[PDB]
Amino acid sequence: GGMTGILFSLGASMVLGGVAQMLAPKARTPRIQTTDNGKQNTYFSSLDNMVAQGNVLPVLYGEMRVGSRVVSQEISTADEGDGGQVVVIG
Amino acid sequence: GMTGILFSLGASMVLGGVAQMLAPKARTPRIQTTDNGKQNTYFSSLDNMVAQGNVLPVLYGEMRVGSRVVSQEISTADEGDGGQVVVIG
With a CB cutoff of 8 Å and minimum separation 6, the contacts of B66 are B45, B46, B47, B48, B49
| Local structure of residue A12 (DSSP, 8 states) | H
Q: Which of residues 2-31 of B touch A (CB under 8 A)?
A: none
Task: Compute the distance between CA of residue A52 and CA of residue A67 in angstroms, rounded to an integer.
Answer: 13
Q: Do residue B50 and residue A35 have CB atoms under 8 angstroms apart?
A: no
Task: Compute the distance between CA of residue B82 and CA of residue B84 in angstroms, rounded to an integer.
Answer: 7
Task: Compute the distance between CA of residue B63 and CA of residue B51 in angstroms, rounded to an integer.
Answer: 19
CB A34 within 8 A of CB B40: yes
Name chain A contacts of B66, Cβ cutoff 8 Å.
none
Closest Cβ opposite residue A39 in set B32, B35, B53: B53
Question: In angstroms, what CA-CA distances link B40 with A51, A66, A74, B10, B57?
Answer: 28, 32, 38, 36, 16
Can you say how many angstroms the Cα of residue A30 is from the centroid of all Cα atoms in its chain? 10
Q: How was this structure determined?
A: cryo-EM
CB A31 within 8 A of CB A41: yes
Cα-Cα end-to-end distance for chain B: 102
Q: Do residue A40 and residue B49 have CB atoms under 8 angstroms apart?
A: no
Our CA-based measurement puts residue A62 at a distance from the nearest CA of chain B, in whole angstroms, of: 27
